[PDB]
Write a protein that binds this ligand. Structure first.
Ligand SMILES: CCC1=C(C)/C(=C/C2=NC(=C\c3[nH]c(/C=C4\NC(=O)[C@H](C)[C@H]4CC)c(C)c3CCC(=O)O)/C(CCC(=O)O)=C2C)NC1=O
Ligand SMILES: CCC1=C(C)/C(=C/C2=NC(=C\c3[nH]c(/C=C4\NC(=O)[C@H](C)[C@H]4CC)c(C)c3CCC(=O)O)/C(CCC(=O)O)=C2C)NC1=O
Ligand SMILES: CCC1=C(C)/C(=C/C2=NC(=C\c3[nH]c(/C=C4\NC(=O)[C@H](C)[C@H]4CC)c(C)c3CCC(=O)O)/C(CCC(=O)O)=C2C)NC1=O
Ligand SMILES: CCC1=C(C)/C(=C/C2=NC(=C\c3[nH]c(/C=C4\NC(=O)[C@H](C)[C@H]4CC)c(C)c3CCC(=O)O)/C(CCC(=O)O)=C2C)NC1=O
Ligand SMILES: CCC1=C(C)/C(=C/C2=NC(=C\c3[nH]c(/C=C4\NC(=O)[C@H](C)[C@H]4CC)c(C)c3CCC(=O)O)/C(CCC(=O)O)=C2C)NC1=O
Ligand SMILES: CCC1=C(C)/C(=C/C2=NC(=C\c3[nH]c(/C=C4\NC(=O)[C@H](C)[C@H]4CC)c(C)c3CCC(=O)O)/C(CCC(=O)O)=C2C)NC1=O
Lengths: 160, 49, 162, 162, 160, 160, 162, 162
């Protein structure tokens, strides 16, 4: 999180935290309630987000669910949707953390090898998380939507 | 006036025995077996993803 | 290292759960104490040399045998290394107080420290006395609300050494 | 008296605790077996006279001297008391199976029964074999699971008398 | 318990349970899971129910915590809330039991002499249990609120 | 009936009915309608029940209507079938009441003394009730047969 | 005593006829009211103390001479007897309402009450007023239909005492 | 029962002897302590409820486990039974003080009391402690003159249980 990043930076230099680092921590904890309600809102609507994002993903990309597609069949489609659910959970974790560190280290490092071993197209990941972005920023207000969209954009860039 | 002793001082309570929890009873064991199936079914009515 | 937020994230990630009402309660609890922690860290960083001065003076007053000829704090080199170790403890305690968690202590200070001191000949009881003295010196400056929290990490260091 | 529900309630009341997941699990187990218990109780109640018929017949076949002149079951009155005692045991075993607990047995059957029979020269071992005769007859009527269930309470009475 | 009451009534008449009592037992055993749901719902809101009920009781009877009252002071108020918590636990016991027996042998027999020795006013106990009734029935659906209010009314009438 | 037994049980301790006792009465009044249909079905087919039961009894027990038997003679056979009619009416009463109380308090107390004064053989009455149960349960469905045969079995045990 | 069902059973037994359509209609009518009666009985059981409280308050407000020196209710003993009588009236009217029939009032309330009060010199009109007071108090707590049903038995009690 | 006067009378009746100087001395001693005993008994009559209140409060303060879940005095029924036992003890100790003799204690309290408490699982040590609490409260209320006398009967009861 923001605190962990600041402390690690101050530790690699063997110094106390700078006034600017304390200022960024102050701003982070001051905005904790708004991002906390943002995570609350995204958490209440897990099922709707996953269902709608899957629908737009499969309509935009029929080949994924067509015979010979990686997500073909009911159980592989469910695995697709639960990967999307994993990433929505990581996005909530990142929102409360104030940085994309939970996403980076739970669902980014080694994602290419994992999805290569699984025959999962990385582009398909990209439009899947873009669809989840659209659904998830639909439910939030403009500032909250932008703040959440930054995390979704980071995830889409990581999968790309 | 044969005796001044109390024939029935009180009745010893049967509230708690020592041992024999009766949870190992095969009928109760079948009950814990079936509640597991009920819980599994409840899990299955959840969305597959 | 992990902070309070990442500790909650861990607890809910190992269970594959989204955040619950208890998770939001713990996150609220951490956010509420944030300004207190920032103020305390600023105060400690401002007065680090002063705090180390009082802590070292108290430790060497209670145990003049450390700085007598043949003690482990007897030379300019070893006196400097002692006050350097006290700087280490103060700085990492400030880190842990900002994080709201003691993980950084375990990973960066206490790991192998007991055997390192035993091999160096550094007295561990005297090091615990120095850490405690630093705790009372710091608690006065930070204030009661901050002192109660900072003593948690000082006592964590003392218990890890013991 | 006490049943399984009341047993869980009393266990948690002695601890001063609200119900936990284990308590709810035990309660669900009793609620799961309630229907089987009711079926066994109903089929026992419908056929109680027959069970006593056969159990007394087997006991007095194996032990003829009980009903020969001078035996403890030799008179119309003492024979009637004998079969009445067997019906008592059957009814209270049905009560205990329906309750799921043996506290009613200790409270309302076994308490003072051994010295009741010893003050009367009633053969306690012969009563025990009468109880196993009832066990064998009842098991064939109630079915395998309910047979294993009723056997617990029949053996409880047999062990308390022995 | 319901089964205990049926067995005791049958034993008083020295008979086996009639098909009516067996049908009653089947009904209770069928309602057991709903009873357990209600008991869990009340148990999870332990602290909220006790706090709100104490608030309503003390606002409705200010003299109880007023000087010269039995609940004057912090520790006597804490004992008051402890008594309310006892009775809430007893109500959950009664819900799972399907009748008011456990409530009776734990909290109703001799309560008059006990609270007399404690110079605790019984009427104030009655408004306390009515406040508990309101709070607890507020968190349940109307159907479940009915049976829960039944046990709370038994308690209120037993104390009154 | 069940309501009367509950009221008497409570008046024994001079108390209002417990919530569990009121639940028992609720179950009774819930089963009242099905009991009413069962008794309607029995009362509609009373003529055929009496005819079949009497015929089956007299074929199983010819000595009753044979010369020297108690039931020999047109008027005596009419009296026999009239007794069967009484007991069928009492069974219907017991079915609507849900208990054997009307059955006992019209036709079980003093029945042995009455039939002793009437030279009426008790095993003949038992066989009459058994054949009558067989016919009645034959006319009824599987569910109704159990509780209807319950009262007939009680009556036969009373005569035996 | 007898309830509504038993009343129908007796009226058809004394005439020696099977249940016709009208008997089944009466039984259906009684079964329909069962839930209402059980709710009213539970409400009165919860609030019986308060009903007696405020009904006695109304009665002694309208007739203050009853509880003043020289009145029939003037002593702690006689006031206690008066409130005991009112409590018994309420509980027995509740019994009768549950049963749906006034036989319990005749067998267990009015059986010797008129001439017992005559011997004691208890004023009958004031007892009627107290019963009426309990009638309004119960009606307010039980609502419209249950209040009509209770008023039937209250008026029966008032007529019996009168 | 037996008091001091009847004790002297019985002693001299068994010997068939008229009262001598020693008998008159003992009778004078009882007549001299009579007014003190009567004052103490009247005070205890006036404050018996308060005595039981404070004694039970002290006992349950020293042994909080007794009234918490799992204690022998934890329920409303068992708490009332505990208070009823202490009321017994106070009233009968008052009788024995007013009589000047412990015979009534043996013949109405102690006979079978240990067996009753052992059958019920009642802790004897805690009952003795409650009797000491009653002794302290009663001695404080009755005054120094009668405290020593009253403690004799309280101690007799405690030694009879323990
Ligand atoms: C062998 C290497 C070695 C050295 C050199 C050494 C010096 C040393 N001097 C000390 C105190 C001191 N040192 C001084 C000396 C200073 N006061 C004036 O300013 C002068 C400029 C100057 C003397 C010329 C004084 C006054 C103290 C006492 C300070 C106090 O108690 O507050 C102390 C603190 C512990 C004690 O009181 O003994 C050390 C460790 N220690 C070592 O292990
Ligand atoms: C001294 C008082 C006394 C009496 C009277 C008495 C009767 C008696 N008869 C028995 C068996 C029997 N009793 C009979 C007699 C019946 N068979 C016909 O139906 C007749 C109507 C009737 C006799 C005229 C029969 C056939 C049995 C064998 C039952 C069987 O083995 O299943 C038994 C069972 C034990 C045994 O068979 O030895 C008893 C106890 N016991 C007593 O202690
Ligand atoms: C499980 C059955 C059970 C119950 C219910 C129970 C109640 C109970 N409440 C007590 C004290 C108390 N209880 C209360 C509560 C009252 N004060 C207010 O006026 C209210 C009207 C009312 C509560 C709503 C208070 C104020 C005290 C403190 C009395 C004192 O300190 O003297 C005590 C004395 C011992 C102790 O405090 O631990 C008991 C035994 N004990 C039991 O074993
Ligand atoms: C509602 C309760 C009730 C019952 C049960 C009842 C029975 C009854 N049956 C009677 C006659 C009779 N009842 C029977 C029936 C017997 N014959 C066969 O053996 C059969 C085993 C058996 C019938 C199944 C017979 C034969 C008579 C004629 C007796 C005679 O006139 O000598 C009589 C004498 C009065 C009369 O004949 O009108 C009574 C009182 N009365 C009642 O008020
Ligand atoms: C000779 C035997 C006898 C007694 C003792 C007796 C007492 C008595 N007090 C009454 C009212 C009352 N009595 C009191 C007295 C209470 N106020 C405070 O709380 C005190 C603790 C306490 C008095 C020391 C009060 C306040 C009322 C009015 C109750 C009301 O209107 O709700 C009433 C109801 C009728 C009325 O309003 O006068 C009676 C019958 N009656 C008798 O026949
Ligand atoms: C279970 C049904 C039942 C009832 C209800 C009943 C009433 C009853 N009331 C009695 C006395 C009494 N009843 C009353 C009540 C009256 N005084 C007031 O003015 C009022 C107007 C009125 C009541 C509303 C009083 C004051 C007495 C005492 C009379 C006396 O002893 O002088 C007694 C004499 C025995 C005793 O006092 O314990 C009975 C038996 N008996 C029964 O079997």
């Amino acid at each position: 999180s923001v605190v962990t990043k600041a402390i690690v930076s101050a530790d690699a230099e063997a110094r106390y935290l700078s006034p600017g680092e304390l200022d960024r921590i102050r701003g982070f904890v001051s905005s904790g309630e708004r991002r906390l309600r943002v995570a609350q809102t995204l958490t209440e609507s897990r099922e709707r987000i996953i269902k709608q994002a899957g629908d737009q993903l499969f309509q935009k990309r029929p080949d994924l669910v067509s015979p010979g597609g990686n997500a073909y069949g009911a159980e592989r489609t469910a695995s697709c949707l639960r990967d999307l659910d994993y990433y929505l959970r990581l996005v909530t974790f990142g929102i409360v953390a104030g940085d994309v560190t939970p996403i980076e280290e739970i669902g980014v490092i080694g994602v290419k090898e994992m999805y290569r071993n699984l025959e999962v197209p990385l582009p398909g990941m990209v439009e899947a998380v873009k669809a989840m972005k659209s659904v998830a920023t639909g439910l939030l207000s403009g500032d909250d939507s932008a703040e959440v969209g930054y995390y979704f954009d980071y995830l889409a860039g990581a999968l790309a | 006036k044969q005796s001044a002793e109390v024939v029935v001082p009180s009745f010893k309570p049967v509230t708690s025995p020592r041992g024999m929890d009766m949870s190992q009873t095969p009928l109760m064991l079948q009950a814990m077996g079936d509640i597991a199936e009920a819980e599994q079914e409840v899990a299955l009515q959840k969305p597959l993803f | 290292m992990q902070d309070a937020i990442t500790s909650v994230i861990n607890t809910y990630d190992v269970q594959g759960k989204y955040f619950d009402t208890s998770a939001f309660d713990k996150l609220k609890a951490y956010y509420a104490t944030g300004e207190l922690r920032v103020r305390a860290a600023g105060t400690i960083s401002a007065n680090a040399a002063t705090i180390i001065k009082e802590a070292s003076a108290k430790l060497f007053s209670n145990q003049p045998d450390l700085v007598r000829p043949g003690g482990n704090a007897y030379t300019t080199r070893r006196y400097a290394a002692c006050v350097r170790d006290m700087d280490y403890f103060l700085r990492y305690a400030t880190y842990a107080m900002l994080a709201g968690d003691t993980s950084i202590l375990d990973e960066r200070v206490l790991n192998g420290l007991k055997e390192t001191y035993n091999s160096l000949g550094v007295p561990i009881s005297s090091t615990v006395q120095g850490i405690q003295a630093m705790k009372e010196v710091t608690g006065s400056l930070v204030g009661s609300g901050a002192a109660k929290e900072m003593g948690v990490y000082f006592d964590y260091l003392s218990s890890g050494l013991s």
